[PDB]
């Protein structure tokens, strides 16, 4: 009732060591969600359109021309890393550990509190808050998925990363067909292009309602909600990085000559030439053998086009790859696509004392060697006539359509049946845990934002708003907004989401890679004086393992 | 043995037997040697004959008896592929037995002699990396398997894997002004990993007496059919019906489908045109893919060629038009070459697939979407039309047609010199084939197989000393029999 | 029998997950050993004086004394833990275990072979070498520890610790008692110091023979040899550090003013002056109350005479201390007594290509801060009245005895009921695994060689010698020393030392301290381009704990 807790906070994270190397990770999350009343109660189609940025020519990448749904709901989405882990526990699990299962997850809510304000005419203003031990908190669970899927990670819109930090939710909304069309253009380009709304399909129209498809529970403050265990259908998430390239499959070539003394210099020799040496390779019009041209069982990685921009029924978007750039682990400067990028603000890792709107960003570089290295490459003609003419070779540095700026590995696309590429590694704080898997006929081989794939389901969206909390003047036939007294929502909100990890063996004679604290990044993981926090990115696959 | 089983199958038992003789390592300790090639590189447009690597060279010896043919002779292979339709991998067991180790001492006589001496005590070091730990090094790729022969002793290869290394090479052509990069980066700390056998494999130590065997494994692998399709798109489905057939037999007397062109019924894919041709017709799928030829990719470790899963159209007619897809083998006189030639140049040959999955890229073209026929020059691209200003490329040497709808076949066993089976990636996303063997192992296959004389010391052996350990002059022949079981 | 092995090389190492985070490890150990025969076949009784390098005034240091028997057997010495773990595996159990069990230990000795060597009389000198089926290696294992235990890992001399590296075991000897007299001196001292050997008391001689008190089992080539497993019964070792000094302990004091902004300056204030604050202090006769006056639960640590030398029947000794000095963690060559020094030869982490007798060393810095800081001493006179003058303050720069270079601290000692200390942590690769505890009746708190100490008995040593391989000319009353064939013996030694851990645990928000590869280190685990190997130390204490 209204004196009687209703739940306990939780945010302990247990490891229980299970027979045989395996592990049960029990992550325990508990936050106060601060809820205020929705700005309004009526659900509102809005069209975004910035002509004003997409009608200067070569500006097309910045479109941002839409139609949503604004929902008087909110979203309570918990499906991100920081929710769930504190860096030493994700420390623990990525030193420790060589892969991870999805096991389950549950959530509830609790000590819910509603409070109203009133605020006085009194010229120095003042405002009072008390309790509305009557009022409503209304709670749905979409665990049928009728609803679109909306990850909140991928906008950082998640719960915030911080037990002892009240946290919010995040306002629902979601996207509502529309017809779209946008004429690429550069600088210098003539006239104005075609960039136009073209409206909504009826054919594709879907008004989703929480009311009309989701049950509605009514939490007083004595009241609370759980949402019952999930378990999940997902493949295992690998926690080592491959490195291995076509260039290190199989057997090496034989050494006729080994060095004898040590040096930079002192290399082995092969001491065979090239075109009488034995093995097999797929040129079959050629006797060269060697690294470059021995064949090897498949293909590690592909290439595809990159900052290619696709178009369809709602305009342009960015065509998504499986893995980053090669050469990006060496340099910092050279992350590009396939590098995904989190902007976050101090709900999730940006140093909380910190002050403005320019969110946190980090550029993530993936371990794993899956990547290509495109000034690498080139195309050279059939007939494989050595040292190749300038006529016989396509170069990464020779135009394409004229454009001195566009070579051929801009348009490239290497994918076929023998490719062979890894899932996206786990992003801590910030990446997405799990994602719904498309309902398409033909489905995605993975997903670039989450390393788990729900198969055929996985939890419902939890929905929240405060109830309506009218004054005694409503009048529901008139058009003026309907008149509401100021009223908000604490409620304590609690999961658990469950995994399931091997530990990890030593299989070479040297040790390997492992996140450690250290001098530099000392103060990334403590307060500042004044209470201020942050939250680094951390990569996950330190280890390595062999591909083949 | 072929042993006739009911409904059609047939149990067929490769026994192969071999004597293997097996010299003490050079050295034995692991070593961790880079190879550069520059002097071959840094001649402009020759990256393709690029060989910079760095590898572990270990003092085992790996026997490997991965290639077709260790286990068939020529009349077992014809009985095979005339009489049967598919081939399952079933089984493989091998044992070492009859180990023999022999001393040689070899006088400081003015006339140089040596005597060769048992070495009852001394022991041959066996080791069955059964858990797959050591990394899979197929010897089929560079020929170094068992010998084909069972009256012709034959040899283990050295063992070495590769190690990981970092490495850049910018391309070129003749007539490139300066140097393009071409350097050697070094090891990432991330990806070292510095394997050994007696760290990870437990270690046999056989005398004379002494034998070893696997035990019986057991593959999981998908048939290998041992037909080959001939359809291509263009033979889907049925044929148009002829209204006016030939009256007379004679090379000029063809039959005639009888409807104009655009008047014809059927189902195209051309939502704008009337044309309904053999070209045009909608088919159910695609039958083989096209994929850039000779196009060199790079990674970490440098360029690669971008594999191919099925050869050249045309080759079955000339075989001088074999290219692309189509495998070479070059290998010695324990594979396959005439055993009485002399040289160290190989017998090679290129394998021509009967399949006819390929593709004839000097037959394909792209036109505009207008389809305004006959297509005049602008509305066409050709593969005769140069790409990026190159007289020698053409779109077809960047064209990739590989979609949802593509068909395509496994790679045909390559007698005697395929290998039989291959390794299974570890990766996330697998490759739906391998180009280097029909039989992919989706879980495990068996392991590899690693022998090495133990050191024979001398006296004065001193393991705190910087010079390499002084050894007496050691070797070991010993009988290898394995047993490869198919239905 | 001949033709037959009786046993199988193993090198592996196997970590078995338990119930409830517990481990259970087992180091299986393999080595090729080269055995010559001795070069007497009697004990000898060798007195060692280096009189010519004492007779220097002010090297006392450096006196070498000593009596000891001289035997024809060898010991096969497993004792010191590179023999059992490599880079990986160490890097393994230090990253994820806590505590570390030492279980139980056994071995054998298989595939005997022994030749003989005939060189001939030829001008060209040439040798063979030939089987001799019926020769006989001696083995003998001292279960009972009736011998001296004589742990090789302090002299380096234990097996190599490269399992495809032959290695030797080490000539077998142990002290015979001996009265020495050597009165320090210094540069500058009139006269000859008393440097004196004064003999060998009767009452304390021990002469121990291999033959009279111990089993000895003749192997020829197809015979075995195998100990049985023995079980320690020791104190398990912690994988942890303790960084807390006293100033550390208990409740720290209530900040009154907390900075209101972040950076290096804005330091919080108790806010209390000093002698009008409220707690407990052991100074009875004063007000003030600070970190470094109030009272504390008991002492971390203490102060002890460093390079201090005790003299007793057998001359000097460095007089050893329990933990290392404080600030070597900050400054390596602040590194002092205290801080173990270890040199080390090719089979035993030197680099095995280098060439020259010089030895690889390195100063071994614990994690623990459990150590002084002598300069930060002081003694004031009882009254405490500040700030204290020059006549009642004893400073660490004030001389003792009328030395510029000596001062109090120097012979300072605050070991007490009050010490708090922790055992001393493992060395890898070189450090001693288990030691034998003494059989006097008062026992030390711990030994500073190894962190496992046996309380009743620990494994039996295990000596091997070649069986005399006479010729035909053996006259056995006849002075002259015996005629022997050349033999010698290879034999392949296996071990199995068994550890059970337990699995660590995240307790803080923070990450922790983990080993890990990079690229400083990174050609430390890999071999040479011309096959050579090293093994460089590793710490073993890295994760901290709370001591109070």
Redesign the interface.
């Known amino acids: 009732g209204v004196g009687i807790s209703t739940g306990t906070f939780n945010n302990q ?1 247990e ?1 229980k ?1 299970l ?4 592990v049960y990770i029990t992550a325990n999350s508990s936050r106060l969600v601060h809820l205020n009343m929705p700005e309004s109660e009526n659900y509102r189609r809005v069209v975004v359109n910035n002509l004003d940025k997409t009608a200067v020519n070569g500006n097309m990448a910045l479109d941002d021309t839409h139609a949503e749904i604004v929902t008087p709901w909110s979203l309570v989405d918990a499906n991100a890393w920081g929710v769930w882990f ?7 699990i990525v ?2 550990m060589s892969e991870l299962h999805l096991v389950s997850f549950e959530q509830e809510i609790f000590n819910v509190v509603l409070k109203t304000v009133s605020e006085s005419a009194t010229q120095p203003p003042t405002k009072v808050y008390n309790n509305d031990l009557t009022a409503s908190l209304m709670v749905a669970l979409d665990s049928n998925n009728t609803m679109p899927f909306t990850p909140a990670a991928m906008r950082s819109e998640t719960l915030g990363f911080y037990p002892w930090k009240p946290t919010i939710p995040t306002p629902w909304r979601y996207y509502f067909q529309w017809d779209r069309t946008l004429i690429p253009s550069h600088t210098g380009t003539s006239g104005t292009p075609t960039n136009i709304y073209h409206g909504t399909d009826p054919d594709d129209v879907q008004f989703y309602t929480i009311e009309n498809s989701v049950p509605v529970h009514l939490l007083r403050t004595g009241d609370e909600f759980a949402t019952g265990t999930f378990f999940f259908d997902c ?1 295992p998430c ?1 926690l080592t ?15 006729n000559s ?5 040096g930079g210099t ?5 001491g ?1 030439q ?1 075109d ?26 592909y ?1 595809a086009p990159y900052y290619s921009f696709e178009a369809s029924t709602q305009g342009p978007f960015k065509t998504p790859i499986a893995a980053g750039r ?2 990006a ?2 340099d910092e400067n050279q992350a590009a696509d396939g590098d995904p990028r989190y902007a976050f603000g101090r709900q999730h890792g940006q140093k909380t ?1 910190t002050t403005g709107e320019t969110p946190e960003r980090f550029t993530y570089i993936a ?1 794993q ?16 006539n ?11 540095t ?3 359509g004229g454009k001195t700026g566009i ?2 590995t801009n ?13 996206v590694p786990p992003v801590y704080p910030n990446g997405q845990i799990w994602d719904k898997e498309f309902d398409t006929d ?1 489905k995605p ?2 997903h670039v934002n989450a390393p788990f794939v729900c198969q055929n389901n996985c939890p419902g969206q939890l929905f929240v708003k405060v109830a309506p909390n009218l004054t005694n003047q409503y009048d529901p036939d008139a058009s003026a907004n309907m008149s509401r007294i100021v009223t908000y929502s604490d409620f304590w909100w609690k999961g658990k989401l469950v995994f399931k990890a091997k ?16 001098v530099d990044n000392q103060f990334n ?2 307060p ?3 209470g ?1 926090m942050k939250i680094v990115y951390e990569k996950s696959q ?1 280890a ?5």
């Open positions: 994270t490891f060591f027979e045989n190397g395996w504190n860096p030493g526990d994700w420390q623990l030193n420790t493949k690998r990085h491959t490195w291995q390239t076509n260039r290190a499959l199989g057997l090496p070539p034989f050494l080994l060095p004898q003394s040590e002192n290399f082995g020799y092969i065979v090239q009488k040496r034995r093995g097999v390779t797929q040129m079959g019009n050629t006797n060269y053998i060697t690294e470059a041209t021995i064949m090897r069982p498949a293909e590690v990685g290439s090669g050469g682990q060496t004392t371990h060697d899956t990547g290509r290295y495109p000034e690498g490459d080139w195309i050279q003609n059939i007939n494989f050595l040292p190749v003419t300038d006529d016989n070779v396509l170069l990464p020779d135009p394409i070579n051929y348009i490239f696309n290497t994918y076929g049946p023998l490719t062979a590429l890894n899932n033909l081989r993975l530990l990890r063996a030593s299989h070479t004679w040297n040790p390997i890679q492992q996140m450690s604290i250290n993981y403590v500042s004086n004044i201020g330190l390595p393992r062999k591909l083949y």
